[PDB]
Amino acid sequence: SMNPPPPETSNPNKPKRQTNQLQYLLRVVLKTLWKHQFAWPFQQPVDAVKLNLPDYYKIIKTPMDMGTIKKRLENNYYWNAQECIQDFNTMFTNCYIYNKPGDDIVLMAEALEKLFLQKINELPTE
Ligand SMILES: Cc1c[nH]nc1CN1CCN(c2nc(-c3[nH]c(C)c4c3CCCC4=O)cs2)CC1
């Protein structure tokens, strides 16, 4: 079995920006979710080989994880906050697509997503 290449975290062809909203996404949103007791499954791309999930990347064609998001923020990969918010939402949605309601991993995603929503509700104006 094989994992796909991880999502890119650098691309010199892609225009970059640092905005106050992106700074908030790193210092408040990512930091809060990253330290949570349920963060660990989301801190790296899913290793479908080690986890014996040979169907994971048959079902999930837009993988995303907080380790990737963290690196994208640190490397100023994004142009705007909406790009980064979309990556978070992709991560949560993938979890709900692949797994079953009530699975431990879904309960963990739901706890992180509640906090995500609480923080982005106070995203500062640009
Ligand atoms: C040792 C350590 C401490 N902190 N971080 C680490 C390194 N990694 C350690 C392994 N790990 C892991 N993720 C998962 C994981 N994740 C998602 C989003 C999953 C799954 C399985 C089910 C379906 C699913 O949707 C399993 S094992 C991720 C992090």
Cα distance between residue 92 and residue 69, in whole Å: 13
CA of 13 relative to ligand 1 center, distance in Å: 31
**Could you tell me if residue 68 is inside a domain?**
yes
Domain holding 33, by residue range, is 19-123
CATH number, domain containing residue 30: 1.20.920.10
Sequence-ordered list of residues with C-beta below 8 angstroms from that of 105, at least 6 positions apart, any chain: 41, 95, 99
Cα distance between residue 15 and residue 61, in whole Å: 24
- CA 56 remoteness from chain centre: 16
- The resolution, in Å, is 1.5
Pocket of ligand 1 (CB under 6 A): 40-44, 46, 51, 95, 98-99, 105
Cα distance between residue 14 and residue 75, in whole Å: 12
Cβ proximity of 74 and 26 under 8 Å: yes
The phi, psi pair for 106, rounded to 5°, reads: -70, -40
Cβ proximity of 106 and 71 under 8 Å: no
**Distance of CA 92 to CAs 13, 75, 101, 110, 124, Å?**
28, 22, 13, 8, 23
What is the tally of structural domains in the chain? 1
Q: Please indicate the experimental technique that yielded this structure.
A: X-ray
Q: Which residue's CA is the nearest one to ligand 1's atom 24?
A: 95
CA of 3 relative to ligand 1 center, distance in Å: 14
* Chain position carrying tokens 């994208």: 72
SS (H, E, C) 60-80: CCCCCCHHHHHHHHHCCCCCC
- CA 80 remoteness from chain centre: 15
